[PDB]
């Protein structure tokens, strides 16, 4: 619900702090801002919220690009520090703000007990003196903050004289020695940037009364607040500190690791932006499984299908009636989607099949090799207990419909088969949500070496596809000697 929204006059803003990498929760915020802007044919601003001193701008902009979220203009909170100072002074002159040198603990217990600080009654001229001490960075100023004068007895703790301005000399941004708080800066900056609908998380809904109080007390143009719920996932860390620990201790080898909930992370993992947006629209800690099922339903109709077998469990099958001449046939990349085009299939008398499949056959069973035809299994050579080889006869014109058992396969053409590594990942932690390192899966990157069809040479980095009867994958990397690294996409 966007209050009084008018087509062509809606302005939202996405306000990420430029102190970290965007993650999936940020994505819900950025997407809802864009979605309401587009709904009303309006504008979405990008504001780097650097209100308090602590270069990720490029990462953030690149992730906004990758999600297809455009914005009309980029600004920084700090662009308005001058004007915020002016407004702080105006509020002192209206006796709506005062300089308080009370310590933090006693301020908090005074606030909890509705006790007005003795400084609440400071004169205007004294309040201004003390604000200037804060601006100059003196020890006097470092002892003081500026609070708003609202209502200490209010049932809303955010209306009990919230801090507006603080003296921060300790750390660099050293130009300013006092800084507005987020609670004071946000309504003011939203007003002066022309925001009409300021989106905000569910957490602390008490601050809306405060935000409106700042707007109206300064007689600024009104801004509506819309609220949405935070997006958080089970078995997922999103703290900056915890992610930092993972990286520094070589649990992952970068901040783009496909187990990370960063935007880069889960796009590398195979997620489409359409899947994320649709999940947000059609939906506390969420379960990943509906997100990955929506991804599966989105990607399955528009990705090619290839075959792969385990490079070392796979067993040799020989159709003894054929020769070693390699026959080539054109086939569809997608059986139900002719637009994805064709590739080349190659066959001979020698094949590789999966050992889990080969253990399931018995003499003179009829089965099907997908995209090729039927075969009659004749002999199972078991040397030293394990299956060593399977001999069968071609029956390519027999009816595959009469077969309950249809399997995938590779031609045994090793100078043409492409070697690949499958990376299957799991959650970095084991519980849903200080000894926390006791619950890390230090072994959540399972690798499998496989052969894949020659035609898979056609793929480019980041293409998605399906391995027959294996699952869904994204091409992450291409090695020297044409060796591919493929990440399994979860499918719910
Ligand atoms: N898990 C989440 N789900 C949805 N939106 C989020 C989530 N985390 C942050 N956001 C939204 O992302 C935007 C910027 O977040 P950022 O962390 O950069 O600022 P912040 O000051 O730390 O605010 P927050 O304390 O909410 O994270 C804000 O609109 C924020 O409310
Ligand atoms: Cl406080
Ligand atoms: Cl919501
Ligand atoms: Cl390691
Ligand atoms: Cl990596
Ligand atoms: Co339109
Ligand atoms: Co910066
Ligand atoms: Co000092
Ligand atoms: Co799971
Ligand atoms: Co020959
Ligand atoms: Co024939
Ligand atoms: Co595992
Ligand atoms: Co390698």
Distance CA 295, CA 276 (A): 8
Q: Give the CB-side neighbour count of residue 482, counting CA atoms within 13 A.
A: 13
Question: What does residue 208 show for φ and ψ, rounded to 5 degrees?
Answer: -70, -40
In this structure, the number of other CB atoms found within 10 A of the CB of residue 303 comes to 20
Active-site residue, 85 included: no
Q: Give the CB-side neighbour count of residue 226, counting CA atoms within 13 A.
A: 22
In this structure, the number of other CB atoms found within 10 A of the CB of residue 25 comes to 16
Kindly compute the dihedral angle of the four CA atoms of residues 38, 40, 42, 43, in this order, to the nearest 10 degrees. Answer: -50
**Three-class DSSP category at 217:** helix
In this structure, the number of other CB atoms found within 10 A of the CB of residue 346 comes to 16
Indicate whether residue 225 lines ligand 1 (CB < 6 A): no
Distance CA 394, CA 295 (A): 39
Question: Phi-psi bin for 309: left (phi > 0), alpha (psi -120 to 50), beta?
Answer: beta
Indicate whether residue 355 lines ligand 1 (CB < 6 A): no
User: What are the CA-CA distances from residue 239 to residues 15, 21, 49, 243 (Å)?
Assistant: 18, 11, 18, 6
Indicate whether residue 201 lines ligand 1 (CB < 6 A): yes
Active-site residue, 230 included: yes
Instruction: Write the CB contacts of 137 (distance below 8 Å, at least 6 apart in sequence).
Output: 167, 169, 177, 178
Indicate whether residue 47 lines ligand 1 (CB < 6 A): no
* Pair of tokens at residue 323: 């020769």
Q: Which atom of ligand 1 is nearest to the CA of 22?
A: 18
CB 365 within 8 A of CB 405: yes
428 is in an annotated binding site: no
- Given the residues 135, 230, 290, 311, the one annotated as active site: 230
Question: What does residue 13 show for φ and ψ, rounded to 5 degrees?
Answer: -150, 140
Hey, what long-range contacts does 291-295 have (CB within 8 A, 24 or more apart)? Answer: 291/492, 292/489, 292/490, 292/491, 292/492, 293/491, 293/492, 294/492, 295/270, 295/271, 295/489, 295/490, 295/491, 295/492
- Given the residues 86, 108, 136, 240, the one annotated as active site: 240
Angle formed at CA 106 by CA 104 and CA 108, multiple of 5 degrees: 70
What is the per-residue burial (b if ≥16 Cβ within 10 Å, else e) of 428-450?
Answer: bbeeeeeeeeeebeeebbeebeb
Question: Terminal CA-to-CA distance of the chain, rounded, Å?
Answer: 31
CB 217 within 8 A of CB 87: no
Instruction: Write the CB contacts of 135 (distance below 8 Å, at least 6 apart in sequence).
Output: 85, 141, 177, 178
Identify which ligand lies nearest to the alpha carbon of 350. 10
231 is in an annotated binding site: yes
DSSP category for residue 221: P
Helix axes 182-192, 81-93, angle to 10 degrees: 110
The full DSSP string for 84-132 is: HHHHHHHHHHTTSEEEE---HHHHHHHHHTTPPPGGGG--HHHHHHHHH
Q: Is 6 buried (19+), middle (13-18) or exposed (0-12) by CB count in 10 A?
A: exposed
300 is in an annotated binding site: no
What is the dihedral sign for C-alpha 204, 206, 210, 212? positive
Edge-to-edge strand ranges of the sheet holding 145-148:
97-100, 145-148, 163-167, 178-180
Indicate whether residue 29 lines ligand 1 (CB < 6 A): yes
Q: How far is the CA of 75 from the centre of ligand 3 (A)?
A: 26
Of 46, 228, 230, 262, the residue with max ligand 1 atoms within 8 A of its CB, to mutate for a pocket test, comes to 230
Question: What does residue 199 show for φ and ψ, rounded to 5 degrees?
Answer: -90, 145
Of 25, 182, 280, 283, the residue with max ligand 1 atoms within 8 A of its CB, to mutate for a pocket test, comes to 25
Q: How far is the CA of 33 from the centre of ligand 1 (A)?
A: 12
Instruction: Write the CB contacts of 218 (distance below 8 Å, at least 6 apart in sequence).
Output: 87, 90, 91, 188
Q: How far is the CA of 219 from the centre of ligand 5 (A)?
A: 52
Q: Is 218 buried (19+), middle (13-18) or exposed (0-12) by CB count in 10 A?
A: middle
DSSP category for residue 262: B
Q: How far is the CA of 15 from the centre of ligand 1 (A)?
A: 8
Identify which ligand lies nearest to the alpha carbon of 167. 8
Instruction: Write the CB contacts of 243 (distance below 8 Å, at least 6 apart in sequence).
Output: 237, 255, 260
* Pair of tokens at residue 266: 């889960």
Alpha-helix residue ranges (DSSP H) falling in 119-262: 124-136, 139-142, 182-192, 207-217, 240-248
R_g (Cα) of the chain, nearest Å: 31
Q: How far is the CA of 60 from the centre of ligand 7 (A)?
A: 11
Distance CA 19, CA 2 (A): 30
427 is in an annotated binding site: no
Count of residues making up the chain: 492
Distance CA 332, CA 340 (A): 8
E strand map for 281-347: 305-306, 308-310, 315-319, 327-332, 342-347
Angle formed at CA 280 by CA 198 and CA 28, multiple of 5 degrees: 45
Identify which ligand lies nearest to the alpha carbon of 327. 11
Q: How far is the CA of 138 from the centre of ligand 8 (A)?
A: 8
E strand map for 408-480: 410-411, 418-425, 445-452, 464-467, 471-478
Indicate whether residue 232 lines ligand 1 (CB < 6 A): yes
CB 147 within 8 A of CB 92: no
Q: Which atom of ligand 1 is nearest to the CA of 199?
A: 29
CB 447 within 8 A of CB 435: no
């Amino acid at each position: 619900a966007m209050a009084n929204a008018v087509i062509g006059n809606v302005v939202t803003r996405f306000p990420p702090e430029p102190s970290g990498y965007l993650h999936v929760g940020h994505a819900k915020a950025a997407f809802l801002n864009n979605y309401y802007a587009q709904m009303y044919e309006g504008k979405m601003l990008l504001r780097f919220d650097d209100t308090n001193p602590v270069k990720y701008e490029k990462s953030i902009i690149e992730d906004l690009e990758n999600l297809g979220l455009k914005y009309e203009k980029i600004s920084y909170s700090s662009d308005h520090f001058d004007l915020l100072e002016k407004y702080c002074i105006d509020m002192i002159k209206m006796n709506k703000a005062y300089a308080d040198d009370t310590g933090v603990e006693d301020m908090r217990n005074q606030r909890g007990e509705g006790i007005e600080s003795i400084n609440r009654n400071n004169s205007i001229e004294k309040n201004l003196e003390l604000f200037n001490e804060m601006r100059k960075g003196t020890e006097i100023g470092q002892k003081n903050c500026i609070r708003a004068k609202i209502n200490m007895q209010s049932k809303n703790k955010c209306m009990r004289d919230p801090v507006m301005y603080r003296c921060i000399v300790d750390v660099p941004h050293f130009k300013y020695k006092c800084y507005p708080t987020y609670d004071f800066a946000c309504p003011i900056i939203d007003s002066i940037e022309g925001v009409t609908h300021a989106l905000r998380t569910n957490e602390y809904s008490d601050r809306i009364e405060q935000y409106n109080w700042f707007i109206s007390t300064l007689n600024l143009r009104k801004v509506y607040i819309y609220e949405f719920s935070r997006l958080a996932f089970v078995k997922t860390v999103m703290s900056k500190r915890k992610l930092k620990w993972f990286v520094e201790n070589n649990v992952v080898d970068s901040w783009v690791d496909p187990r990370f909930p960063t935007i880069k992370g889960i796009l590398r993992r195979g997620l489409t932006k359409e899947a994320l947006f649709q999940f947000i629209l059609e939906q506390n800690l969420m379960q990943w499984d509906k997100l990955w099922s929506i991804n599966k339903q989105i990607i399955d109709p528009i990705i090619p299908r290839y075959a792969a077998v385990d490079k070392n469990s796979s067993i040799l099958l020989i159709l003894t009636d054929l020769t070693d001449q390699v026959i080539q046939k054109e086939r569809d990349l997608h059986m139900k989607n002719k637009s994805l085009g064709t590739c080349n299939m190659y066959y001979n008398n020698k094949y590789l099949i999966e050992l889990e499949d080969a253990q399931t056959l018995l003499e003179n069973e009829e089965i099907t090799l997908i995209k090729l035809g039927n075969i009659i299994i004749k002999n199972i050579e078991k040397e030293n207990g394990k299956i060593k080889q399977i001999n069968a006869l071609s029956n390519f014109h027999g009816d595959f419909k009469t077969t309950k058992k249809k399997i995938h396969w590779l031609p045994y053409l090793p100078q043409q088969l492409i070697t690949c590594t499958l990376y299957e990942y799991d959650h970095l932690i084991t519980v849903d949500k200080d000894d926390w390192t006791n619950f890390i899966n230090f072994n959540s990157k399972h690798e499998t070496l496989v052969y894949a069809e020659p035609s898979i040479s056609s793929l480019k980095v980041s293409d998605k596809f399906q391995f027959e009867r294996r699952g869904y994958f994204i091409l992450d990397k291409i090695d020297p000697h044409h060796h591919l690294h493929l990440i399994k996409i979860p499918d719910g």
